[PDB]
Design a protein around this ligand. Structure first.
Ligand code: NA
Lengths: 99, 9, 276
């Protein structure tokens, strides 16, 4: 039995154009643990993204935080792309700047 | 501190 | 108040791609403090919180050796469980284990834990008495019989009542400026129009530690649980956490709605409303 990931895309601090921040993609609720996560800038993969050490929740589902430093601007569009055995094709979740 | 000497399943 | 120490083990087979990977991570409360990964270029127990760095070489060598031994033991266990379920050599399978202790404000053991899963489903768990087992099925009964024959529950109890609480108390003192500090949420309420009929009220909580929090919407003082969208608490990356709760409200009825925030870092619970 397999579980598909939940995905949240968000910044560490409230976003301010021109000021350095961290962009987060938090993937959780999934099983098994193999998963592919990319952070995207205007559709292109960001290089050297870091991630947390694999752990899991009380219901045994896994969670991981993928993150990178970035400086938001008005033009730039950010997203997180996730593939998992439960997904026919990769899921793209856009960074909704205003929330 | 980890638990040592675990028995296999 | 009370505190916890937990270790999380994941062992994953991968036929055709080498031997099963073993990962171990340790937490105090919601703070990770160590990690081990058998796939690392040179596997070692490694610090992940600044207050564990002061432990000496004997500590790091001892926990590294336990983790290296566990890499082998969990490979044995994966072979065994494959057999208990009559599974082929071709599939990838996962054992997960969580164990550790809770202590009260005075440092006394409140409860110990040891629980295991196979392919995401509960497999075997130590009962709260720290002396008997609950097995999920006839395969887990084989492990139970093995562990009953080895008196393994007695070994868990000795660890949980001894080393686990002793080292948790040590960690809590060495990391007291962070582990025993609760950071309150920074809060605000946003308003997102949907149509001429409705708008969304969203209550935000940012930068709090630990992760435990209560965010609720009320309408005329009555909880709106069924109507509230509650996102999963999420890590900010700087040790703190984030969460929001949202409710869809009829236009002009916004002042009937209040957001209530409870968190250990707060002097008193918060009541918030939208401020246009
Ligand atoms: Na897929």
């Amino acid at each position: 039995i397999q579980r598909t990931p939940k995905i949240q895309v968000y910044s560490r601090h409230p976003a301010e154009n021109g000021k350095s921040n961290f962009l987060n993609c938090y993937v959780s609720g999934f099983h098994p643990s193999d998963i592919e996560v990319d952070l995207l800038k205007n559709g292109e993969r960001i290089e050297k993204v870091e991630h947390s050490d694999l752990s899991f929740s009380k219901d045994w589902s896994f969670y991981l935080l993928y993150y990178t430093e970035f400086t938001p601007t008005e033009k730039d569009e950010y997203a997180c792309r996730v593939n998992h055995v439960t997904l026919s094709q990769p899921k793209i979740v856009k960074w909704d700047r205003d929330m | 501190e980890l638990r040592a000497r675990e028995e296999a399943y | 108040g009370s505190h916890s120490m937990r270790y999380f083990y994941t062992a994953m087979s991968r036929p055709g791609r080498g031997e099963p990977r073993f990962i171990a991570v340790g937490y105090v409360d919601d703070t990770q403090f160590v990690r081990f990964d058998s796939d690392a270029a040179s596997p070692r127990m490694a610090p992940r919180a600044p207050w564990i760095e002061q432990e000496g070489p004997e500590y790091w060598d001892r926990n590294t050796q336990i983790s290296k031994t566990n890499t082998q033991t969990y490979r044995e266990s994966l072979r065994n469980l494959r057999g208990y379920y009559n599974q082929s050599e071709a599939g990838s399978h996962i054992i997960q284990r969580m164990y550790g202790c809770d202590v009260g404000p005075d440092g006394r053991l409140l409860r110990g834990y040891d629980q295991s899963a196979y392919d995401g489903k509960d497999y075997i768990a130590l009962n709260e008495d720290l002396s008997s087992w609950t097995a999920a099925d006839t395969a887990a009964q084989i492990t139970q019989r093995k562990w009953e024959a080895a008196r393994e529950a007695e070994q868990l109890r000795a660890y949980l009542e001894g080393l686990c609480v002793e080292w948790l108390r040590r960690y809590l003192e060495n990391g007291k400026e962070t582990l025993q500090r609760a950071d309150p949420p920074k809060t605000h309420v946003t308003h997102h129009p949907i149509s001429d009929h409705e708008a969304t009220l969203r209550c935000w909580a940012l930068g709090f530690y630990p992760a435990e929090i209560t965010l609720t919407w009320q309408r005329d003082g009555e909880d709106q649980t069924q109507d509230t969208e509650l996102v999963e608490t999420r890590p900010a990356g700087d040790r703190t956490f984030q969460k929001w709760a949202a409710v869809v409200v009829p236009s002009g009825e916004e002042q009937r709605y209040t957001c209530h925030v409870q968190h250990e870092g707060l002097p008193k619970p918060l009541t918030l409303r939208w401020e246009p």
